[PDB]
Design a protein around this ligand. Structure first.
Ligand SMILES: [Mg+2]
Ligand SMILES: [Mg+2]
Ligand SMILES: [Mg+2]
Ligand SMILES: [Mg+2]
Ligand SMILES: [Mg+2]
Ligand SMILES: [Mg+2]
Ligand SMILES: [Mg+2]
Ligand SMILES: [Mg+2]
Ligand SMILES: [Mg+2]
Ligand SMILES: [Mg+2]
Ligand SMILES: [Mg+2]
Ligand SMILES: [Mg+2]
Ligand SMILES: [Mg+2]
Ligand SMILES: [Mg+2]
Ligand SMILES: [Mg+2]
Ligand SMILES: [Mg+2]
Ligand SMILES: [Mg+2]
Ligand SMILES: [Mg+2]
Ligand SMILES: [Mg+2]
Ligand SMILES: [Mg+2]
Ligand SMILES: [Mg+2]
Ligand SMILES: [Mg+2]
Ligand SMILES: [Mg+2]
Ligand SMILES: [Mg+2]
Ligand SMILES: [Mg+2]
Ligand SMILES: [Mg+2]
Ligand SMILES: [Mg+2]
Ligand SMILES: [Mg+2]
Ligand SMILES: [Mg+2]
Ligand SMILES: [Mg+2]
Ligand SMILES: [Mg+2]
Ligand SMILES: [Mg+2]
Ligand SMILES: [Mg+2]
Ligand SMILES: [Mg+2]
Ligand SMILES: [Mg+2]
Ligand SMILES: [Mg+2]
Ligand SMILES: [Mg+2]
Ligand SMILES: [Mg+2]
Ligand SMILES: [Mg+2]
Ligand SMILES: [Mg+2]
Ligand SMILES: [Mg+2]
Ligand SMILES: [Mg+2]
Ligand SMILES: [Mg+2]
Ligand SMILES: [Mg+2]
Ligand SMILES: [Mg+2]
Ligand SMILES: [Mg+2]
Ligand SMILES: [Mg+2]
Ligand SMILES: [Mg+2]
Ligand SMILES: [Mg+2]
Ligand SMILES: [Mg+2]
Ligand SMILES: [Mg+2]
Ligand SMILES: [Mg+2]
Ligand SMILES: [Mg+2]
Ligand SMILES: [Mg+2]
Ligand SMILES: [Mg+2]
Ligand SMILES: [Mg+2]
Ligand SMILES: [Mg+2]
Ligand SMILES: [Mg+2]
Ligand SMILES: [Mg+2]
Ligand SMILES: [Mg+2]
Ligand SMILES: [Mg+2]
Ligand SMILES: [Mg+2]
Ligand SMILES: [Mg+2]
Ligand SMILES: [Mg+2]
Ligand SMILES: [Mg+2]
Ligand SMILES: [Mg+2]
Ligand SMILES: [Mg+2]
Ligand SMILES: [Mg+2]
Ligand SMILES: [Mg+2]
Ligand SMILES: [Mg+2]
Ligand SMILES: [Mg+2]
Ligand SMILES: [Mg+2]
Ligand SMILES: [Mg+2]
Ligand SMILES: [Mg+2]
Ligand SMILES: [Mg+2]
Ligand SMILES: [Mg+2]
Ligand SMILES: [Mg+2]
Ligand SMILES: [Mg+2]
Ligand SMILES: [Mg+2]
Ligand SMILES: [Mg+2]
Ligand SMILES: [Mg+2]
Ligand SMILES: [Mg+2]
Ligand SMILES: [Mg+2]
Ligand SMILES: [Mg+2]
Ligand SMILES: [Mg+2]
Ligand SMILES: [Mg+2]
Ligand SMILES: [Mg+2]
Ligand SMILES: [Mg+2]
Ligand SMILES: [Mg+2]
Ligand SMILES: [Mg+2]
Ligand SMILES: [Mg+2]
Ligand SMILES: [Mg+2]
Ligand SMILES: [Mg+2]
Ligand SMILES: [Mg+2]
Ligand SMILES: [Mg+2]
Ligand SMILES: [Mg+2]
Ligand SMILES: [Mg+2]
Ligand SMILES: [Mg+2]
Ligand SMILES: [Mg+2]
Ligand SMILES: [Mg+2]
Ligand SMILES: [Mg+2]
Ligand SMILES: [Mg+2]
Ligand SMILES: [Mg+2]
Ligand SMILES: [Mg+2]
Ligand SMILES: [Mg+2]
Ligand SMILES: [Mg+2]
Ligand SMILES: [Mg+2]
Ligand SMILES: [Mg+2]
Ligand SMILES: [Mg+2]
Ligand SMILES: [Mg+2]
Ligand SMILES: [Mg+2]
Ligand SMILES: [Mg+2]
Ligand SMILES: [Mg+2]
Ligand SMILES: [Mg+2]
Ligand SMILES: [Mg+2]
Ligand SMILES: [Mg+2]
Ligand SMILES: [Mg+2]
Ligand SMILES: [Mg+2]
Ligand SMILES: [Mg+2]
Ligand SMILES: [Mg+2]
Ligand SMILES: [Mg+2]
Ligand SMILES: [Mg+2]
Ligand SMILES: [Mg+2]
Ligand SMILES: [Mg+2]
Ligand SMILES: [Mg+2]
Ligand SMILES: [Mg+2]
Ligand SMILES: [Mg+2]
Ligand SMILES: [Mg+2]
Ligand SMILES: [Mg+2]
Ligand SMILES: [Mg+2]
Ligand SMILES: [Mg+2]
Ligand SMILES: [Mg+2]
Ligand SMILES: [Mg+2]
Ligand SMILES: [Mg+2]
Ligand SMILES: [Mg+2]
Ligand SMILES: [Mg+2]
Ligand SMILES: [Mg+2]
Ligand SMILES: [Mg+2]
Ligand SMILES: [Mg+2]
Ligand SMILES: [Mg+2]
Ligand SMILES: [Mg+2]
Ligand SMILES: [Mg+2]
Ligand SMILES: [Mg+2]
Ligand SMILES: [Mg+2]
Ligand SMILES: [Mg+2]
Ligand SMILES: [Mg+2]
Ligand SMILES: [Mg+2]
Ligand SMILES: [Mg+2]
Ligand SMILES: [Mg+2]
Ligand SMILES: [Mg+2]
Ligand SMILES: [Mg+2]
Ligand SMILES: [Mg+2]
Ligand SMILES: [Mg+2]
Ligand SMILES: [Mg+2]
Ligand SMILES: [Mg+2]
Ligand SMILES: [Mg+2]
Ligand SMILES: [Mg+2]
Ligand SMILES: [Mg+2]
Ligand SMILES: [Mg+2]
Ligand SMILES: [Mg+2]
Ligand SMILES: [Mg+2]
Ligand SMILES: [Mg+2]
Ligand SMILES: [Mg+2]
Ligand SMILES: [Mg+2]
Ligand SMILES: [Mg+2]
Ligand SMILES: [Mg+2]
Ligand SMILES: [Mg+2]
Ligand SMILES: [Mg+2]
Ligand SMILES: [Mg+2]
Ligand SMILES: [Mg+2]
Ligand SMILES: [Mg+2]
Ligand SMILES: [Mg+2]
Ligand SMILES: [Mg+2]
Ligand SMILES: [Mg+2]
Ligand SMILES: [Mg+2]
Ligand SMILES: [Mg+2]
Ligand SMILES: [Mg+2]
Ligand SMILES: [Mg+2]
Ligand SMILES: [Mg+2]
Ligand SMILES: [Mg+2]
Ligand SMILES: [Mg+2]
Ligand SMILES: [Mg+2]
Ligand SMILES: [Mg+2]
Ligand SMILES: [Mg+2]
Ligand SMILES: [Mg+2]
Ligand SMILES: [Mg+2]
Ligand SMILES: [Mg+2]
Ligand SMILES: [Mg+2]
Ligand SMILES: [Mg+2]
Ligand SMILES: [Mg+2]
Ligand SMILES: [Mg+2]
Ligand SMILES: [Mg+2]
Ligand SMILES: [Mg+2]
Ligand SMILES: [Mg+2]
Ligand SMILES: [Mg+2]
Ligand SMILES: [Mg+2]
Ligand SMILES: [Mg+2]
Ligand SMILES: [Mg+2]
Ligand SMILES: [Mg+2]
Ligand SMILES: [Mg+2]
Ligand SMILES: [Mg+2]
Ligand SMILES: [Mg+2]
Ligand SMILES: [Mg+2]
Ligand SMILES: [Mg+2]
Ligand SMILES: [Mg+2]
Ligand SMILES: [Mg+2]
Ligand SMILES: [Mg+2]
Ligand SMILES: [Mg+2]
Ligand SMILES: [Mg+2]
Ligand SMILES: [Mg+2]
Ligand SMILES: [Mg+2]
Ligand SMILES: [Mg+2]
Ligand SMILES: [Mg+2]
Ligand SMILES: [Mg+2]
Ligand SMILES: [Mg+2]
Ligand SMILES: [Mg+2]
Ligand SMILES: [Mg+2]
Ligand SMILES: [Mg+2]
Ligand SMILES: [Mg+2]
Ligand SMILES: [Mg+2]
Lengths: 138, 124
RNA sequence: GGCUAAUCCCCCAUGUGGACCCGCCCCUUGGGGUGUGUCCAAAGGGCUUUGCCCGCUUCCGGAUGGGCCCGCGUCCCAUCAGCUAGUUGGUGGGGUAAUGGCCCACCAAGGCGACGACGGGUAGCCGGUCUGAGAGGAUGGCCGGCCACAGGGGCACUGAGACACGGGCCCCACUCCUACGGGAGGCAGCAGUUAGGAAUCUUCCGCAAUGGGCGCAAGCCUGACGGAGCGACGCCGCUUGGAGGAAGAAGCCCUUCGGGGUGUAAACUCCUGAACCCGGGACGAAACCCCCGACGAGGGGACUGACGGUACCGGGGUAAUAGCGCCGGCCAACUCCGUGCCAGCAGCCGCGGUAAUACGGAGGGCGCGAGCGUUACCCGGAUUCACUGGGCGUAAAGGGCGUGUAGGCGGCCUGGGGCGUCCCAUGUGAAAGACCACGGCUCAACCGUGGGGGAGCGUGGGAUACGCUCAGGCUAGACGGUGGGAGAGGGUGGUGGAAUUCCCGGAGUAGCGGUGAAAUGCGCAGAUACCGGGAGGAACGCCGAUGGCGAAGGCAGCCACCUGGUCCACCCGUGACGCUGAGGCGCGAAAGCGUGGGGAGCAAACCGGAUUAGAUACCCGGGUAGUCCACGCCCUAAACGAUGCGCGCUAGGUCUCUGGGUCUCCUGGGGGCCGAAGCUAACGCGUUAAGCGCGCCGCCUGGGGAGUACGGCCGCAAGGC
RNA sequence: UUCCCGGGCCUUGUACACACCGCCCGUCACGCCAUGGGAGCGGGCUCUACCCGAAGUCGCCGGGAGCCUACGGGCAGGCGCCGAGGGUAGGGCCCGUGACUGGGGCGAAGUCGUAACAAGGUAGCUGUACCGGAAGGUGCGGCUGGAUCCUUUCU
């Protein structure tokens, strides 16, 4: 059992991209699908596919990065520079609407689960709802 | 600590002990001199430092420093304890305020006169 | 003892109505209605005297103020771990405005506690305030709200209300009066005194205002209050002048003796006019009251100041207080002289032992300025208790290891609920304060008016992603089945050879042993070296590893029994059954303890021989406990990977142990070495993380004092926690 | 080229850095200081059992033993429960004082050694155990945080 599945996703992504892997698999949940879909829509991943590994469902996340660079260390600027959990089991964090973070001066996002569904901080504010603060990406 | 651990045990606020029991929380205590003597200072220096054993209104006997050049104090003179200690001296935790009670100020001192308790002289 | 009035007490009546028993009805804890029965009312006074007033009585509402009850929040110590006899409930009753063990009687045997009861310590609580970027920390003077007390302790009486600060009773301590029988007090009201203390004010003015009590009023009372006084205690406003004035006086300081500095600073010229003198002179005050009207609405009229001749306006008018800290670094400001580890400085670092920007003075300078410093204390910096926002291989810090209790945490899909979560409305969130705006004292301080915001909690409504719950599915976790393994994993029995020591015997003879060198010691009663035989105790050479097993401690000859863990394969069963774990419990090297055994070698202590200046040692010869067994204690450790457990994720290379596979090699599970990314203070770690993440436990907060003291708990003790 | 002296290069351990003529441990004696523990006394608060008990409310009596009476009852008075406080015996806390005392600081590093740091000259450290003027030595077991592959103190 993963204790936090959602984190395990976020991290799978973290390590994945930090080696510039082209794609990575995470065990599939509809919720994870949702989170992903937000990233995709926000330009953070390339997109993802539902897929099958040894007959068990995964979602395959295809990662994007910047150009190649010059000087020593040609390695590309990450597109997800930073991705982290906020709510975790065993400390659950919920913001009301007025308490919804703005992130990296607007240049980042926060993904909240709400009774209106999974939305970006901007999305949630425009919808005028709060909820469980799932993670921040930038 | 886990968060749950903090919810259980918490964090310990840490208190500081007062460098001065002039008690009362008071800024000064009055006392009487007991012994007025001289003492040699700690390892890095040498001098003869002037001190009084004082018996305070606050019930305590304490050694106090007598700052400045000259001094008039002797066995029965009553004095004011202002606190702040002397570093290169053994167990001297407070200074005597000069100018108050049987402490005279420092004769002829022209310079930082309110420390040392001397009045502004006139000029010609 | 006698007389007497009333709005004082009583009796009979009237019964709008109300109270009480009982019945019914509605409503639902004792709310409302109704019926019979019983019980219950009153007080007069004034006049502009046939009506009006101020009152009285019963009842129903209102308003205002309260009582009681509940959810939640509300300091420190667990070195306080158990507390409980009206204690916990029940019935009946007493008591009250009212619920209630509030109190009593009888009955039952309960109630509370690691979600911290009980105990100890401290403490009025709050609106707010201080600080902080915030989160947070600290605080609760003044003003407003609540509580509690009124010399200490109890108690009730009157009353709508008290268990009453200037009411009552009693006990106690104290003061005072006394004719010694007995009495009188109670400033934590305003002032004031005294004591204590570093320290906190006038025995002022006034009832004019606002407010309060009584009165139909006129009024009376009001140390509530409105004012004044003292204190640089705070805050704000303002003064000690403004303009000109030298290549720049004297004095003083420095000087390379040329000069530099204080410096336009002074002197001086002109101007303004704090102080102060004169004249005017408030607002706050219009009611109550009187008059018309109707004692109403409305209209008209009169009186009334403590602050105070104050503020303010007008006139006149004098160049009119500056001080304190500092100038080594942090920190803005440097030179001379004096002093010579002295005298002294000092917040830390540290200055002073003859060239001192660090002591002391001076010149100069920096900073604030009617202040400036100091002391104390709070927040700050301190991300140094880390929620925001720290950590634990070697810096402080992983529990010696396990088992699991509470508790924390919980894979994939579906549906219901909608508790957490989120949203809308609403109620509350007093005033003051904070904030914004306009405004009023010439400004400000201070003050007024308006506005905004807002956590929390109550109610109604809504959402359902996530968290929970219920229901129902799944198999990727977990366990199980079958099959194949490896192993010093454990307990009990047995049993095998090598060596040591001893005994017996043979043969053999002058030494052996031991050291740097020696000696002690042993040997002619025949040792050492050699052969044979017996006894006994302990430990298992080679295999053996750079190996394996185990949670740890630890575990090595062979055999049998008993028994624990574990890896792989097949993908068969269960279907989330999962991870962690305070406490508890169990285990726990060595040494040590108790009882009884055993005792070959070794060996603390000890006995000797050496060495040394000594030698309570290192070296040599002996040797007791012990080392071994059984049973019972002990609970420690460099109990070391100095690295908690579990899971998921992140290049490889190479060596190995053990499975499976089409057996260059591949695929699991362990052990090693280099190393990607990455981490790290470095050293180093790196799919056996010290990397990236989640869950949970343990622990850390400078060194010494100190693993000490005290307390408690273990233990036979030693000692442990 | 072993040894003595001086020296060069590489490497290694270090707790040295006025740098091995370096660093550094413990015991002792008598002063003086400020702490901490502390029997015995002295004061306080508290709790338990027992005995005494004001005031007051409540309960009962209230009687040819008092007052009023419309004879219904009322008052006085008495008695009892509770009860502030007091007494005796005890457990606990706190304050004061205090005999006696542990460890520390200053005298002076004074004294004896030389235990640790370099292979510290017997590698160290460690739990334990015995022993010794003292650092310490020794036994057992453990650790690496151990160098390299005669004895001979101090500065
Ligand atoms: Mg909210
Ligand atoms: Mg010096
Ligand atoms: Mg004198
Ligand atoms: Mg200070
Ligand atoms: Mg000075
Ligand atoms: Mg009479
Ligand atoms: Mg008469
Ligand atoms: Mg009647
Ligand atoms: Mg009627
Ligand atoms: Mg009733
Ligand atoms: Mg009446
Ligand atoms: Mg009448
Ligand atoms: Mg009310
Ligand atoms: Mg009782
Ligand atoms: Mg009954
Ligand atoms: Mg009852
Ligand atoms: Mg009662
Ligand atoms: Mg009453
Ligand atoms: Mg009864
Ligand atoms: Mg009873
Ligand atoms: Mg609870
Ligand atoms: Mg108290
Ligand atoms: Mg108090
Ligand atoms: Mg407090
Ligand atoms: Mg903080
Ligand atoms: Mg706050
Ligand atoms: Mg508070
Ligand atoms: Mg006050
Ligand atoms: Mg006051
Ligand atoms: Mg108040
Ligand atoms: Mg009282
Ligand atoms: Mg008094
Ligand atoms: Mg008293
Ligand atoms: Mg009283
Ligand atoms: Mg009344
Ligand atoms: Mg009262
Ligand atoms: Mg009074
Ligand atoms: Mg009164
Ligand atoms: Mg009396
Ligand atoms: Mg008198
Ligand atoms: Mg009086
Ligand atoms: Mg009296
Ligand atoms: Mg007074
Ligand atoms: Mg005095
Ligand atoms: Mg006053
Ligand atoms: Mg008066
Ligand atoms: Mg008045
Ligand atoms: Mg009035
Ligand atoms: Mg009236
Ligand atoms: Mg009249
Ligand atoms: Mg009159
Ligand atoms: Mg009067
Ligand atoms: Mg006043
Ligand atoms: Mg004064
Ligand atoms: Mg003064
Ligand atoms: Mg001012
Ligand atoms: Mg001019
Ligand atoms: Mg000109
Ligand atoms: Mg000049
Ligand atoms: Mg001049
Ligand atoms: Mg000159
Ligand atoms: Mg020259
Ligand atoms: Mg000149
Ligand atoms: Mg001028
Ligand atoms: Mg001129
Ligand atoms: Mg003039
Ligand atoms: Mg005038
Ligand atoms: Mg007026
Ligand atoms: Mg007027
Ligand atoms: Mg009047
Ligand atoms: Mg008129
Ligand atoms: Mg008329
Ligand atoms: Mg009239
Ligand atoms: Mg009128
Ligand atoms: Mg009028
Ligand atoms: Mg006047
Ligand atoms: Mg006047
Ligand atoms: Mg005029
Ligand atoms: Mg004027
Ligand atoms: Mg002038
Ligand atoms: Mg002038
Ligand atoms: Mg000045
Ligand atoms: Mg410096
Ligand atoms: Mg400054
Ligand atoms: Mg400077
Ligand atoms: Mg001198
Ligand atoms: Mg000189
Ligand atoms: Mg000098
Ligand atoms: Mg010098
Ligand atoms: Mg100087
Ligand atoms: Mg200085
Ligand atoms: Mg100076
Ligand atoms: Mg000066
Ligand atoms: Mg100056
Ligand atoms: Mg000040
Ligand atoms: Mg303060
Ligand atoms: Mg502070
Ligand atoms: Mg901060
Ligand atoms: Mg600190
Ligand atoms: Mg830190
Ligand atoms: Mg944190
Ligand atoms: Mg830390
Ligand atoms: Mg950790
Ligand atoms: Mg290492
Ligand atoms: Mg450590
Ligand atoms: Mg461990
Ligand atoms: Mg477990
Ligand atoms: Mg459980
Ligand atoms: Mg579940
Ligand atoms: Mg779930
Ligand atoms: Mg659960
Ligand atoms: Mg649902
Ligand atoms: Mg809901
Ligand atoms: Mg809605
Ligand atoms: Mg609202
Ligand atoms: Mg309200
Ligand atoms: Mg609200
Ligand atoms: Mg408000
Ligand atoms: Mg204001
Ligand atoms: Mg604001
Ligand atoms: Mg204005
Ligand atoms: Mg606010
Ligand atoms: Mg608020
Ligand atoms: Mg609701
Ligand atoms: Mg729904
Ligand atoms: Mg299910
Ligand atoms: Mg199946
Ligand atoms: Mg099997
Ligand atoms: Mg086979
Ligand atoms: Mg075995
Ligand atoms: Mg075996
Ligand atoms: Mg023989
Ligand atoms: Mg023979
Ligand atoms: Mg011989
Ligand atoms: Mg021998
Ligand atoms: Mg012989
Ligand atoms: Mg012989
Ligand atoms: Mg012989
Ligand atoms: Mg012979
Ligand atoms: Mg023989
Ligand atoms: Mg023979
Ligand atoms: Mg033989
Ligand atoms: Mg034999
Ligand atoms: Mg034998
Ligand atoms: Mg045998
Ligand atoms: Mg064995
Ligand atoms: Mg091994
Ligand atoms: Mg081991
Ligand atoms: Mg088996
Ligand atoms: Mg198996
Ligand atoms: Mg299956
Ligand atoms: Mg099935
Ligand atoms: Mg589920
Ligand atoms: Mg445990
Ligand atoms: Mg068990
Ligand atoms: Mg053991
Ligand atoms: Mg043993
Ligand atoms: Mg034994
Ligand atoms: Mg024997
Ligand atoms: Mg010997
Ligand atoms: Mg020697
Ligand atoms: Mg000697
Ligand atoms: Mg000898
Ligand atoms: Mg020996
Ligand atoms: Mg022998
Ligand atoms: Mg031997
Ligand atoms: Mg024995
Ligand atoms: Mg023994
Ligand atoms: Mg790869
Ligand atoms: Mg094979
Ligand atoms: Mg491997
Ligand atoms: Mg490596
Ligand atoms: Mg690297
Ligand atoms: Mg890190
Ligand atoms: Mg590096
Ligand atoms: Mg792996
Ligand atoms: Mg590998
Ligand atoms: Mg391992
Ligand atoms: Mg891991
Ligand atoms: Mg680390
Ligand atoms: Mg700290
Ligand atoms: Mg300390
Ligand atoms: Mg210990
Ligand atoms: Mg204690
Ligand atoms: Mg003890
Ligand atoms: Mg224990
Ligand atoms: Mg015992
Ligand atoms: Mg011990
Ligand atoms: Mg040489
Ligand atoms: Mg060379
Ligand atoms: Mg070389
Ligand atoms: Mg080198
Ligand atoms: Mg040497
Ligand atoms: Mg004592
Ligand atoms: Mg005691
Ligand atoms: Mg009694
Ligand atoms: Mg009562
Ligand atoms: Mg009774
Ligand atoms: Mg009769
Ligand atoms: Mg009678
Ligand atoms: Mg009668
Ligand atoms: Mg009586
Ligand atoms: Mg009694
Ligand atoms: Mg009593
Ligand atoms: Mg010390
Ligand atoms: Mg001593
Ligand atoms: Mg010494
Ligand atoms: Mg040694
Ligand atoms: Mg040595
Ligand atoms: Mg050694
Ligand atoms: Mg040696
Ligand atoms: Mg040796
Ligand atoms: Mg020895
Ligand atoms: Mg040892
Ligand atoms: Mg050993
Ligand atoms: Mg260490
Ligand atoms: Mg070592
Ligand atoms: Mg070795
Ligand atoms: Mg030598
Ligand atoms: Mg020496």
């Amino acid at each position: 059992m993963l204790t936090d599945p959602i984190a395990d996703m976020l991290t799978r992504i973290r390590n994945a991209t930090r080696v510039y892997k082209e794609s990575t698999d995470v065990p599939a949940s509809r919720f994870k699908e949702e989170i992903l879909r937000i990233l995709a829509r926000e330009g953070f991943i390339k997109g993802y596919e539902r897929v099958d590994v040894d007959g068990k469902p995964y979602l395959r996340v295809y990662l994007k990065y910047g150009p190649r660079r010059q000087g020593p260390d040609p390695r590309p600027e990450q597109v997800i520079h930073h991705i982290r959990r906020i709510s975790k089991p065993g400390r659950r964090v919920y913001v009301g609407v007025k308490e919804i973070p703005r992130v990296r001066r607007g240049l980042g996002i926060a993904i909240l689960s709400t009774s209106k569904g999974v939305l970006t901080d901007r999305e949630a504010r425009k919808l005028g709802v709060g909820g469980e603060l799932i993670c921040e990406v930038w | 600590p886990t968060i749950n651990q903090l919810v259980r045990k918490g964090r310990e606020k840490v208190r500081k002990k007062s460098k001065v029991p002039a008690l009362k929380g008071a800024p000064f205590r009055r006392g009487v001199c007991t012994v007025v003597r001289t003492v040699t200072p700690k390892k890095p220096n040498s001098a003869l430092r002037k001190v009084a054993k004082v018996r305070l209104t606050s019930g305590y006997e304490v050694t106090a420093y007598i700052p400045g050049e000259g001094h008039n104090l002797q066995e029965h003179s009553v004095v004011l304890i202002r606190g702040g200690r002397v570093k290169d001296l053994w167990g001297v935790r407070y200074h005597i305020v000069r100018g108050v009670y049987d402490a005279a100020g420092v004769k002829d001192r022209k310079k930082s006169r309110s420390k040392y308790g001397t009045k502004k002289p006139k000029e010609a």
